[PDB]
Amino acid sequence: GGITVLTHSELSAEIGVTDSIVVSSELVMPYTVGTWLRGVAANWSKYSWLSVRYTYIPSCPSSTAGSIHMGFQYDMADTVPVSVNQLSNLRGYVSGQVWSGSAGLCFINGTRCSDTSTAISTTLDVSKLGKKWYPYKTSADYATAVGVDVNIATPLVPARLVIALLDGSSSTAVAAGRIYCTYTIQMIEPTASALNN
Amino acid sequence: PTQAGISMAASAQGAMVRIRNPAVSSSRGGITVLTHSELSAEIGVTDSIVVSSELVMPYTVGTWLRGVAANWSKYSWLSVRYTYIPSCPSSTAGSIHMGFQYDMADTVPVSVNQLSNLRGYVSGQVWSGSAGLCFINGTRCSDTSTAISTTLDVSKLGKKWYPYKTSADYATAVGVDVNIATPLVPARLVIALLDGSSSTAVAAGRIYCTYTIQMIEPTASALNN
Amino acid sequence: PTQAGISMAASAQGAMVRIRNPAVSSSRGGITVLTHSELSAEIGVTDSIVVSSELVMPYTVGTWLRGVAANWSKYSWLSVRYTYIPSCPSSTAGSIHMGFQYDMADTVPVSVNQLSNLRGYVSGQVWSGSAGLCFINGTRCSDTSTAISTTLDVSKLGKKWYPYKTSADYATAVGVDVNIATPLVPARLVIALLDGSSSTAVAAGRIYCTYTIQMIEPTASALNN
Amino acid sequence: GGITVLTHSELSAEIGVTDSIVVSSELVMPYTVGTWLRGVAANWSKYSWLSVRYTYIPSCPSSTAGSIHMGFQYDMADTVPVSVNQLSNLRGYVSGQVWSGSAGLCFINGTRCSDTSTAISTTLDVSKLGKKWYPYKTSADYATAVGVDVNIATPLVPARLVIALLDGSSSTAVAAGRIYCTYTIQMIEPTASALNN
Ligand SMILES: [Ca+2]
Ligand SMILES: [Ca+2]
Ligand SMILES: [Ca+2]
Ligand SMILES: [Ca+2]
Numbered sequence: 120g121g122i123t124v125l126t127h128s129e130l131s132a133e134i135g136v137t138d139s140i141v142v143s144s145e146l147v148m149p150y151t152v153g154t155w156l157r158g159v160a161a162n163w164s165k166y167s168w169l170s171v172r173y174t175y176i177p178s179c180p181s182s183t184a185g186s187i188h189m190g191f192q193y194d195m196a197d198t199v200p201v202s203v204n205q206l207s208n209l210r211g212y213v214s215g216q217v218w219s220g221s222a223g224l225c226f227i228n229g230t231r232c233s234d235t236s237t238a239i240s241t242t243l244d245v246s247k248l249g250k251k252w253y254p255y256k257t258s259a260d261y262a263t264a265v266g267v268d269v270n271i272a273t274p275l276v277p278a279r280l281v282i283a284l285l286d287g288s289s290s291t292a293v294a295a296g297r298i299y300c301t302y303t304i305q306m307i308e309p310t311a312s313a314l315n316n
Numbered sequence: 317p318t319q320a321g322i323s324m325a326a327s328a329q330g331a332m333v334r335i336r337n338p339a340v341s342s343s344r345g346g347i348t349v350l351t352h353s354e355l356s357a358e359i360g361v362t363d364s365i366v367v368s369s370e371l372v373m374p375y376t377v378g379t380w381l382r383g384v385a386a387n388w389s390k391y392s393w394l395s396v397r398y399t400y401i402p403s404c405p406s407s408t409a410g411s412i413h414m415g416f417q418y419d420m421a422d423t424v425p426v427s428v429n430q431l432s433n434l435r436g437y438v439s440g441q442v443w444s445g446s447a448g449l450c451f452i453n454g455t456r457c458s459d460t461s462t463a464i465s466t467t468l469d470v471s472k473l474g475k476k477w478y479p480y481k482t483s484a485d486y487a488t489a490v491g492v493d494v495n496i497a498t499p500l501v502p503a504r505l506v507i508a509l510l511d512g513s514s515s516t517a518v519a520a521g522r523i524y525c526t527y528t529i530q531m532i533e534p535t536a537s538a539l540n541n
Numbered sequence: 542p543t544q545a546g547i548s549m550a551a552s553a554q555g556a557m558v559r560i561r562n563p564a565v566s567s568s569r570g571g572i573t574v575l576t577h578s579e580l581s582a583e584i585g586v587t588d589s590i591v592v593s594s595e596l597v598m599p600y601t602v603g604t605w606l607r608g609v610a611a612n613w614s615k616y617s618w619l620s621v622r623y624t625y626i627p628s629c630p631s632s633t634a635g636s637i638h639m640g641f642q643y644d645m646a647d648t649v650p651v652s653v654n655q656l657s658n659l660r661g662y663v664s665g666q667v668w669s670g671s672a673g674l675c676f677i678n679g680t681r682c683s684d685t686s687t688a689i690s691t692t693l694d695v696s697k698l699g700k701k702w703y704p705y706k707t708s709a710d711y712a713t714a715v716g717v718d719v720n721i722a723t724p725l726v727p728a729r730l731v732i733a734l735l736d737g738s739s740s741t742a743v744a745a746g747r748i749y750c751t752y753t754i755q756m757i758e759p760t761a762s763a764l765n766n
Numbered sequence: 767g768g769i770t771v772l773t774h775s776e777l778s779a780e781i782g783v784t785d786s787i788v789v790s791s792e793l794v795m796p797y798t799v800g801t802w803l804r805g806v807a808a809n810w811s812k813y814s815w816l817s818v819r820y821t822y823i824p825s826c827p828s829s830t831a832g833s834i835h836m837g838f839q840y841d842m843a844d845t846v847p848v849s850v851n852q853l854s855n856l857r858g859y860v861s862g863q864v865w866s867g868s869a870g871l872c873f874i875n876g877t878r879c880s881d882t883s884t885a886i887s888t889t890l891d892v893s894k895l896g897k898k899w900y901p902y903k904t905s906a907d908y909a910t911a912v913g914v915d916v917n918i919a920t921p922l923v924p925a926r927l928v929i930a931l932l933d934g935s936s937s938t939a940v941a942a943g944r945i946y947c948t949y950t951i952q953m954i955e956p957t958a959s960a961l962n963n
Contacts, residue, residue: 327828327829328828328829328863328865329863330862330863330865330866330884331862331863332860332861332862332866332867332883332884332885332886333859333860333861333862334859334860334888335854335859335860337857354851354854354855355850355851355853355854355861356851357851358787358850358932358933379849379851379852379854379855380855403831403832403833403863403864403933404831404832404863404933404935405828405829405830405831407829408831517785518785518831518935519785519831519832519833519932519933519934519935520933521833521933522833522850522933524854
């Protein structure tokens with residue numbers, strides 16, 4: 120009672136596949152997970168992750184050279200991996216060919232999952248996060264805060280998803296796949312949409 | 317002491333310290349447990365009061381622990397204990413004082429009194445506390461009613477899970493505003509030394525820390541700040 | 542394959558890698574055992590032969606292992622395995638080659654042939670070896686007759702106990718004379734890549750290393766060179 | 767057969783006690799353990815440690831403020847501890863009041879040891895040393911070798927004993943105690959005395 124529990128699955132990020140190891144990162148918070156949730160979660164001041172799961176889903180030919188990597192960092196102050204190696208250490212390291220993972224599909228439509236060993240997907244260890252409840256922060260205000268000092272962020276966001284997309288066959292981008300997020304969340308302490316930062 | 321109430325003060329106390337190999341265990345689920353002891357600080361006493369403070373976080377507590385916990389993003393204190401060992405004669409004059417604070421913004425105590433109020437307070441002659449040895453070496457404990465050592469009440473701190481921070485980056489963040497610190501470290505140890513006999517510092521003792529930590533969510537040692 | 546002798550080549554192979562949490566255990570006596578897996582190197586193939594070499598010592602093997610073993614003065618390899626995973630299509634042209642050398646003074650191989658002679662040699666199409674996945678993830682192993690992965694014969698090296706060395710200081714010592722190295726590192730991995738189709742390097746695969754190490758005689762992380 | 771086994775106990779180093787943490791180090795090899803052994807071991811080319819044990823023995827008043835520390839390093843390349851803290855980490859860390867340890871005495875005369883818990887003394891973990899057999903090296907030639915590069919030493923000496931003598935009551939030295947070494951050694955491959963380096 121009091122809370123509100125949404126459980127959904129939307130595209131979290133489109134992936135381009137190249138040959139020069141490009142390394143990105145997304146905060147594991149509502150405003151960043153995806154457009155849809157970003158829209159809802161706003162109506163609630165704080166929230167708590169219950170089950171966060173990013174899953175890669177291909178959309179390219181089998182003749183598409185390339186591998187993708189995912190992992191998690193938690194002390195926002197830490198330096199985002201420079202080498203994919205450094206990345207393979209993080210919690211929940213995972214990596215497969217940018218055209219495989221077809222099987223992970225059963226995480227997005229919420230169907231009965233058969234064998235998920237071939238699925239390029241990792242989860243968030245919710246039990247080991249700083250706070251139980253976090254404040255809904257807008258990318259804007261967040262940046263402004265990390266501008267003064269990054270550490271002021273450790274209490275605004277639970278973790279960060281480190282993504283690496285190396286190995287390709289061309290110097291320019293080639294559409295490869297998408298990373299959808301399948302989360303279960305508890306939204307609380309409602310608020311006017313435009314009053315959230 | 318044979319009878320009851322009678323006490324004999326030695327010319328000087330002596331405790332032979334021997335630290336046993338570390339204890340590490342990767343318990344499925346993520347956490348890696350480490351329990352070890354290290355010489356945390358060197359002590360000196362003067363006729364005028366002196367207040368020393370040390371953050372009770374990985375990078376600061378242990379010199380070995382620093383390099384170890386580096387490979388993990390977070391940690392949770394499970395048991396932190398600062399024990400005191402006198403390396404001087406009973407003919408020495410002086411007393412020690414310890415306690416904890418939890419909001420770095422609070423000013424650092426300046427009177428043996430203010431300090432008497434802090435959590436887990438402890439006082440005692442600079443030349444006593446040898447009793448606490450059994451803690452550091454890790455043997456069977458006898459009469460500890462005479463020992464000078466305190467423990468961090470891990471039971472009630474900000475979070476259970478704190479981020480591994482580096483003295484450097486830490487200070488940088490505290491430079492902005494001290495307050496940014498509360499979400500970076502649980503508490504800190506306060507240490508006072510007065511009732512000494514000379515204006516020039518005298519060899520008092522040393523403080524060893526014996527802790528048990530939980531380390532989680534791995535990371536390349538050098539990617540950690 | 543249903544019958545026997547018949548083999549079907551896929552348009553492309555795929556292996557979903559998932560590295561499990563490290564395994565650490567402080568076994569009384571001194572040694573601290575660590576068994577973990579890490580992405581050791583990125584691969585690329587060209588029409589002309591290319592010989593890459595990597596020292597098989599802590600600081601070099603693993604990026605996590607680097608920060609870990611730092612807290613111990615020595616170590617003994619117990620099982621080192623370099624596995625290869627193809628991240629490309631069977632339509633790709635190219636083969637890989639690996640083996641070990643033990644005297645850094647020996648010149649680095651320059652022919653796929655010379656390399657065929659080295660210890661624990663292995664060859665195979667750039668797009669194969671997916672079979673070896675079960676090694677890295679650490680699952681139940683099936684048919685590995687098709688996998689591209691080799692192991693270091695820890696059974697016979699200079700010493701059982703080597704000193705933790707740092708790339709920096711190491712090189713400095715090798716600068717004096719390479720030979721000073723033999724008592725600093727067991728052996729090294731040789732890796733060749735030829736039979737490719739373009740002058741400009743192409744995404745081949747990647748090599749993960751899965752090792753089990755013994756670490757001993759503690760030291761402050763920063764006092765180690 | 768062939769070998770030769772000496773087991774002895776002689777003064778390895780006199781100790782001065784001060785207030786400014788002075789940190790020394792001695793190689794755990796024949797030429798350095800002590801004068802007597804240095805003299806014998808020379809007649810043999812190589813040798814192997816069987817049981818090395820440094821023991822501190824007081825020789826001062828009980829009114830002598832001070833503590834002593836001992837430990838071991840093995841990668842001769844490592845930087846000798848700068849702080850006693852750093853020292854308390856090494857294998858076999860030990861430390862007690864510079865006037866205690868009276869009990870350790872039973873290690874020097876080889877008598878029946880009662881309770882040795884109060885003895886300031888540590889041992890060498892022989893089972894975990896690089897080589898089984900080492901070459902007898904003279905301080906001279908050793909320095910000359912470490913002059914070119916320290917690493918050229920890891921194969922000449924098994925380990926190094928790090929000793930710290932902090933906490934005192936005076937700015938100048940005060941005779942405190944001695945560190946005797948009680949070793950069991952295997953001397954081999956004999957040689958003319960003056961031909962050993
Ligand atoms: Ca908000
Ligand atoms: Ca950190
Ligand atoms: Ca070293
Ligand atoms: Ca010689």
